[PDB]
Enzyme design. Sequence first.
Site, mmCIF file in Angstrom:
data_model
loop_
_atom_site.group_PDB
_atom_site.id
_atom_site.type_symbol
_atom_site.label_atom_id
_atom_site.label_comp_id
_atom_site.label_asym_id
_atom_site.label_seq_id
_atom_site.Cartn_x
_atom_site.Cartn_y
_atom_site.Cartn_z
ATOM 1 N N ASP F 148 -0.001 -2.423 -3.014
ATOM 2 C CA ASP F 148 -0.631 -1.139 -2.889
ATOM 3 C C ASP F 148 -1.103 -0.755 -4.276
ATOM 4 O O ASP F 148 -0.335 -0.733 -5.222
ATOM 5 C CB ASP F 148 0.385 -0.170 -2.279
ATOM 6 C CG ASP F 148 -0.191 1.196 -1.939
ATOM 7 O OD1 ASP F 148 -1.410 1.451 -2.120
ATOM 8 O OD2 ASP F 148 0.606 2.047 -1.463
ATOM 9 N N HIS F 221 -6.703 1.539 7.676
ATOM 10 C CA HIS F 221 -6.616 2.337 6.470
ATOM 11 C C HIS F 221 -7.677 1.927 5.460
ATOM 12 O O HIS F 221 -8.375 2.784 4.867
ATOM 13 C CB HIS F 221 -5.196 2.215 5.922
ATOM 14 C CG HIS F 221 -4.930 3.031 4.685
ATOM 15 N ND1 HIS F 221 -4.526 4.305 4.737
ATOM 16 C CD2 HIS F 221 -4.952 2.687 3.351
ATOM 17 C CE1 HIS F 221 -4.341 4.781 3.496
ATOM 18 N NE2 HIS F 221 -4.599 3.789 2.645
#
Lengths: 308, 310, 308, 308, 308, 310
Positions: F148, F221
């Site tokens: 991430d 996402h």
Amino acid sequence: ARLAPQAVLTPPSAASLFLVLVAGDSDDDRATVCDVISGIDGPLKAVGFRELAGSLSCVVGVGAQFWDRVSASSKPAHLHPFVPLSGPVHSAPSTPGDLLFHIKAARKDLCFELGRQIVSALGSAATVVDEVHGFRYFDSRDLLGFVDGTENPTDDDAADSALIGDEDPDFRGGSYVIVQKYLHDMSAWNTLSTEEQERVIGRTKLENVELDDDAQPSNSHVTLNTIVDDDGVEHDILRDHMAFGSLGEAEYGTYFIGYAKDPAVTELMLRRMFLGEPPGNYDRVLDFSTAATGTLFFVPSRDVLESL
Amino acid sequence: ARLAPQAVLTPPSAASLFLVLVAGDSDDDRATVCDVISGIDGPLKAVGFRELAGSLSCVVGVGAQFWDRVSASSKPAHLHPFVPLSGPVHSAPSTPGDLLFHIKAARKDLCFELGRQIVSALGSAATVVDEVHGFRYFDSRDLLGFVDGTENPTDDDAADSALIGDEDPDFRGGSYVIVQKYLHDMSAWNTLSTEEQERVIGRTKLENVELDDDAQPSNSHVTLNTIVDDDGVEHDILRDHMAFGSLGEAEYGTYFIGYAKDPAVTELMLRRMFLGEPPGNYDRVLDFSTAATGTLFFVPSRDVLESLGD
Amino acid sequence: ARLAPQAVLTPPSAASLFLVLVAGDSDDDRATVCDVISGIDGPLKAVGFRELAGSLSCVVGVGAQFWDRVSASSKPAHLHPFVPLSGPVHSAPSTPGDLLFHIKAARKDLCFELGRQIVSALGSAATVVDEVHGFRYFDSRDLLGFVDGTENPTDDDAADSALIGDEDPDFRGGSYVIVQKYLHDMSAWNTLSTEEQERVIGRTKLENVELDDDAQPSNSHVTLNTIVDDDGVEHDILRDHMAFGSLGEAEYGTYFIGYAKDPAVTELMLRRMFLGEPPGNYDRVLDFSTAATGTLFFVPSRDVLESL
Amino acid sequence: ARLAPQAVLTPPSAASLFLVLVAGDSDDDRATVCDVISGIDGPLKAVGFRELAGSLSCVVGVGAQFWDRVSASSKPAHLHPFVPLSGPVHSAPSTPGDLLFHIKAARKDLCFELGRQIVSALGSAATVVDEVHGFRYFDSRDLLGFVDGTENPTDDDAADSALIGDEDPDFRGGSYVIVQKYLHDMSAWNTLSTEEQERVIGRTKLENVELDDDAQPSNSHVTLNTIVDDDGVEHDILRDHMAFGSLGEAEYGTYFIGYAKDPAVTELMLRRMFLGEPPGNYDRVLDFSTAATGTLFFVPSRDVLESL
Amino acid sequence: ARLAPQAVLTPPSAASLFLVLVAGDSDDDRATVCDVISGIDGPLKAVGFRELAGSLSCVVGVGAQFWDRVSASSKPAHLHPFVPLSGPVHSAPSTPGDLLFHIKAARKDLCFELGRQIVSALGSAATVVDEVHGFRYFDSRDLLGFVDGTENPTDDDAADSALIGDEDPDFRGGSYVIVQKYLHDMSAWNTLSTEEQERVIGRTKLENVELDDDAQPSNSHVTLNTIVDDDGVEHDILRDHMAFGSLGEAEYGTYFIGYAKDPAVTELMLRRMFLGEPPGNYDRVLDFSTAATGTLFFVPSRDVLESL
Amino acid sequence: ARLAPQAVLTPPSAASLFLVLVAGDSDDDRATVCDVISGIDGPLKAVGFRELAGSLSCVVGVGAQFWDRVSASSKPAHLHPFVPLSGPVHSAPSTPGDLLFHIKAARKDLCFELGRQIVSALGSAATVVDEVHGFRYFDSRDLLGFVDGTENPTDDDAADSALIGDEDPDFRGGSYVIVQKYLHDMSAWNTLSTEEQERVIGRTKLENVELDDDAQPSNSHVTLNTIVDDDGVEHDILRDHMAFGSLGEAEYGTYFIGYAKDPAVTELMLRRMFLGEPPGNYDRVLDFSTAATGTLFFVPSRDVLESLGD
Ligand code: HEM
Ligand code: HEM
Ligand code: HEM
Ligand code: HEM
Ligand SMILES: [Cl-]
Ligand SMILES: [Cl-]
Ligand SMILES: [Cl-]
Ligand SMILES: [Cl-]
Ligand SMILES: [Cl-]
Ligand SMILES: [Cl-]
């Protein structure tokens, strides 16, 4: 153990060198080889001392046949050439080697330099027959993407598992080491889903957790490689896998190396892997990995090694 | 061994401090000295605890004279002053010292601060007569440009080489340490070629590989410092060299420090070096290195160290 | 001591996690708990093997009550619950716990992830009753600004001090641990001059040098915590403090953890601190620190733990 | 520059990967290759972001011929295939390559992983034709034992030397890179004394100091590779050598890679090396080193690269 | 700023070396000196390139007298010798120097080796007149126990503060440096309480927090060394203190080095310290520190230096 | 940028501290607040100078309301409170905060000590309303197990994405930062398979490789958080996630923090996430992540920061 040969118990390393050599049939060959490997700490310290950390180590293995050429009595209880396996689907070849140098350090250069000095001292008395430069792949993973080497024993557990042994007291402190250079079918393996892969292995992929007993396939690698005798005593080896490969040659590999006080344990694991248990119920890792080598060496203690 | 005094067997470090002191003559002096050194565990932790790696170590050495002031009762087997050697062109003087602090750490400040707190505790009960701030020079080379420390024993061999055992059971776990501060003649040494330098030492320069028997001069430093008895049994010492110097004074040094279970092994090395073997066949390192100090100390085990004087 | 549970002797670390739990009464609870803790090196290796350095460690403690529920068979000589202390100005409470996990590593993620795996494997069988995420604060200081841990025994000393013991052969290699979570009154502490704070502690603040005999108050934390027997022998413990806290809650903490082969040594330090030597002459550290918890656990050897 | 493609100016690294590929003759090939190398930061960050240090970098080179297949106008001023050299004694071959990936990081695995992703995105659209895994050898030495890469420019010096350039403003920020994979004759080189070796190179061996003008052989490597024009302006390249090799194959190598705003500079050095100056007075390094490759690539700026 | 001479802006380092030298009067001296210093990045690269990290740096300063002997042509606006200060209790001497080498690195060996090469290249043409081997002492403290260097400008601020300057176009990018070697009276200093020492300095000792306005004495080292102009603008310098000393000589030192685009700022700090603000109200740091040296050098940009 | 406040562009760190506070109502309160924050350079150096690497950084953010109390005169172009979003099953609340300290370092203690000195200086002039101690989780993964921070811009792209330029020249070098503290449903998320998780995110899990167009769900996402205008011009933000949590409370978190030159880019990302595109086609990360906070702050450049209030 800083800068000692035959440091079987060292933790894993960023870098490895596996060198496998065959000895000259000659008499002068047998003599240089002996005098080089018996003075192995010389080059070990000659290279190793240049790094403050002192992370460099060197384990020397001598195959059964060459051992015979340099020693009548005494011979350790279980030294024999690597036993080949012919399974329902898959095969473990037994391949030549008289000497193993298993080299570890925190840096590639340290490894390469020790190897260069060794190979050079040997000259035409020996011939490199296999050479892997291993490397740590992220958080101790193999190229199949699993954390590999987890359940290795350590501390006292590891010395009892890897090292002889009141049972053979002339060779106390020594070990038996088996190597196998595996190549992988990356594309095939990548067509499995994570969950299938986990079922093949015995553990989860990212999180490296053992699957529950009631979920753990009877032919998973973890299962096939658990060894319990009649009395319910477990028997473990000490493993020291590294990744290696070639992008252009599409070669992606795991270099297996396992140490044990008795090779019966390692061989039993290999039989349960290639032949299955129950028979035919084999290790699916073998569907995706092919062994190109299989060699067995005796790892003399420092004392026994120095006397040749 | 972490933050324990008398850790003779510690691996090499990035920084070291060697302090040699002479004790005052009084009875105050001698008892201050015994307090500081028997409780050396305190400053060692006071400083060393502050570094997470706990690299700090400190080995305390006591000279033969001072030992007689403190424990006339009970002397370890081989403790005597340093035996001065005197050859035709090169000599190994025997220079004063009652106390040795051999300090090692991963950082200069820790070595310094420990030295500072020790020296501060001794107060006027002792005087520094030698002080060397050692430093690791490249890939463990000495200022002559050679890898140095190589053939040092490790593991069990090291313990056996360096620590008193059954032979002198009252002092099991101690050692005998000899220090010499050498100064080098850099321009003399630089006029040599690499190959000649290698013949002086006994190993190739860059690669630190031992020369083979047939190329290995009988007066190479390596040959002279190989000790093999009649039995054909090898005797080693534990050496811990560091570089030091000052650019303005043109001082380029090697600080020698050798530990042995019996100093006879070290003393013989020195004889072969200075007096040569066969006689006059001396160690040509000495053509380029001059010893300014030479002192022997007993390194008590911890138990023994804690009991002085008291 | 690489990836072994019950590695009591490990050095300080940059991070640690302290978990205290109460088990449920159900026999099924009884059994889940014992499964997880006896197999603890599963998760310890699952997580710890992912770090090259292998810094991760995990010490399991078991409370007196819970031990009884699981092994009325044999008990370690000194296993009783934590004795509360009620002193002239300050008190040490006795608070619940059946399980201690004392986790240490070079990184928070390793600690947290081992904790995640343990807690989750204990599911509803246990409840976290106290949780402290400890950190190294500058050069081994505590939040009162002092180097803290200095006089810990090391090496042999430490083993002698912390590990049972011919004095209790069945639990050879184990230990007893006492934890106390302390909260500080920072503002009060800062009204003292540095010299006053030094008189409270027994050492100089910045330099961490012990005050000499004539300037050491008789109620300094150091004097009080010096335990010398009638033969003049000193008895030490192995301590492992970490800082912790929360800026918004104005919580500034020191988590005390103390290991000993006989907890009476620890307990005696606690008495001399809380009640005083002579009585009333108590540790002025307690004017600025309050114990929110107090629990005693028995620390089994690997063998005993593995068989619960 | 953290995690940017075309970071020509990065310092040296513990590990390198040099990948040289030829493109499919097809149309679909030209299109995948373009879309992969034009989205090169994707895999760069995909791998690189997993290391806290962010040491991974990737420079993409495109050979003259392939550049023509994907772009009419515009073409940078000096892009042409590598010019071969036929010298009095020694020869620099010119060998195939359409793409160069020059990959650096602090770890081998980071390198290998980036290479694996690149090679995989390309699939059958391209073919690996050369692959070196380089490594730092002690204190930035080459396998000849000299400190190598010393006189590299740095900071502003390096940007002016390596990067275009008001002189060709459509391709400002780009560079021209030449690679040559050299293999060494170790045994021959080891028959020279240190001093001879130093004379061949131009600097001392251990201490890495430049020989004095009045002692510096006119055919030393340093001399042949100093470039002064009529006005006395010096012209430098940016070099990024790494060692590589194979013990068993007795292959010991230096991988040359040099960046310049104008390849005229690099080519002049190569001419003075192989042909000599005065003519025939060539670089003795060539007596001990043989180039097996010779390929020239254009290094597009980020902007120019992203638009293909 | 990788391996560039005149890298004034570099951060603190673990080690540094400070060399001050006087040149001989011979014109041949004149020329040797100018050769060595103008080619300074030769040795800087000879040594520094051997460290992967490239932490080594080297700033050359030149004294007013020596500049005159070599470039009566043009002078930097503020190049004059160090002005001695003679104050009510303490004085700052003006001591000789023609050359300053300010060397920094992550390791002593790099510093020492660069020094060895410089000194030796200057041979009899110059004489080392002061030599300090500086070291980092704990968390950036000086030997008085205070964090020292805290309020250094950084980044843009630092360049504005230290580098010339539109105000002197011909020497754009250069600087002026003042060194002073200080020796401390440790015993005297230790008779102060911590609060007193804080009042002397202007900050708290352990926490390095600035004292608030109402508790800051008007003669604190900090107040005195705050330079605010008539428009309320603050003028800062860039400072680089290191600890040094000798245990047997009881020498405990702080080597001051201060860089500024206009030395008048530095000089004014020096006056406010030595003579006081208002006069007589002098820096009580000077009751415990004595300057053994005081010298001013001009720090040329690379361009100007390279052409001397 | 070393030890300078408002270093928006710093690389990721091993440890972070996010503090959000509310200012007191008084005029004292507001001026204490302006002193502490305009002179934040002080505590930053007071702490950070003590670590040789100088990893410590601290970015100060000011909310829209408090900004109006301090500089009614002159407001940056896009400063407003956080725009709450409210979808059928998932919502992004707008929660209080006048002050943001976003602290990063290589070590926890430095983050903590800086926080401590800041909070101590503010005294009763402010109250902490949110506090998160973030930590790097393995190879920069978040607690969902995915790498991430990947597609974050770097270098020039980053500066351009995150810092106010010519468009609002009075505040050149500032930024707009949005924070949200998310809590995860670990058992819900663990019931998914890897392949499904990958479809939620848009990238493979272990290898962090982007899925190809044809395998890439329209409500991944990644898809939802890709912003491309009609011109076909891409707009990015600078994100700085850290993991956090508490094992006893079963709290497993991701602390979100995004910087942008214009918060319109971040706000649109949030709309596509919560309200979906096309409408109702929302980001399934939100099935497993619940926002407990949402606050917007203006990040003044240093020059601007130094001038408050004053
Ligand atoms: C390509 C070859 C191989 C791959 C990719 C592979 C991979 C693995 C993985 C992912 C694990 C689980 C993690 C761990 O506990 O280490 C494992 C465990 C194990 N492997 Fe293999 N392995 C391979 C070859 C072998 C071979 C040939 C042997 C035996 C001769 C073997 C013996 C074991 C043992 C004993 C364990 C631990 C079992 C347990 O107690 O849980 N490995 N290996
Ligand atoms: C808020 C809680 C506490 C704080 C801040 C604190 C702080 C200190 C400090 C600053 C030292 C001196 C340096 C050292 O040797 O570590 C110390 C020493 C010591 N502390 Fe405490 N401590 C605390 C609780 C305790 C408790 C509860 C015990 C006993 C159960 C204890 C046992 C010791 C021991 C045994 C020493 C070494 C004393 C010696 O020199 O022999 N600590 N602690
Ligand atoms: C096997 C191949 C090579 C080896 C072993 C080698 C080795 C060296 C060594 C030892 C140095 C001195 C240290 C330094 O300043 O970097 C050097 C310098 C240099 N090399 Fe080579 N080199 C090789 C190939 C080349 C090639 C093919 C070129 C040109 C295309 C080249 C260009 C240079 C340049 C420009 C310098 C710096 C010259 C100066 O300004 O002093 N290198 N290389
Ligand atoms: C023995 C010599 C010296 C010692 C022990 C000393 C110590 C200190 C200490 C502890 C600080 C506070 C922390 C900091 O900001 O660095 C300080 C600040 C300062 N010092 Fe000194 N110092 C010495 C000499 C000087 C000299 C000679 C100058 C001027 C030529 C000077 C200029 C400064 C400046 C400009 C500051 C920052 C003041 C501010 O906050 O604006 N230092 N020094
Ligand atoms: Cl290798
Ligand atoms: Cl020192
Ligand atoms: Cl944690
Ligand atoms: Cl690679
Ligand atoms: Cl130095
Ligand atoms: Cl924090």
